[PDB]
Design a protein around this ligand. Sequence first.
Ligand SMILES: O=c1c(C/C=C/c2ccccc2)c(O)ccn1Cc1ccc(Cl)cc1Cl
Length: 135
Amino acid sequence: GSHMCDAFVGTWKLVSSENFDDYMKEVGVGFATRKVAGMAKPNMIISVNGDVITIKSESTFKNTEISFILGQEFDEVTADDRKVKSTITLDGGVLVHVQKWDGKSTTIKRKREDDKLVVECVMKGVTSTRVYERA
Ligand SMILES: O=c1c(C/C=C/c2ccccc2)c(O)ccn1Cc1ccc(Cl)cc1Cl
């Protein structure tokens, strides 16, 4: 079939987090923004419309939103308000999302396992891991 939609679409609520503070520090996020973002526990809404995929994150603190095609690079404004250039691909059924800015790079992987959606953020060997369930 064409199973990528059925795997990822829906509304996901955070249920665990590792070293997110550390990840945000390494990306350069300010100390107050880090803490408040860490407490926000935002939902992640994934949707599909033909070739165009969208990932919304919603909290009382801040909303964000990206729409993209796989393989196409696009400008993105991140939750801490960095301007970045992003490319998202489907590699072995995982969504792999790369962010380039000022000669740096961070990678965000989103992978389904069982009833869960696991997100891994890497920045120069600081690694954060967050788990989500359907809400
Ligand atoms: O963008 C995301 C999201 C999606 C929403 C996050 C998000 C977090 C808090 C509030 C709203 C949205 C994740 O699950 C995990 C990582 N990142 C990267 C990131 C996350 C946070 C910050 Cl500050 C900076 C950066 Cl580069």
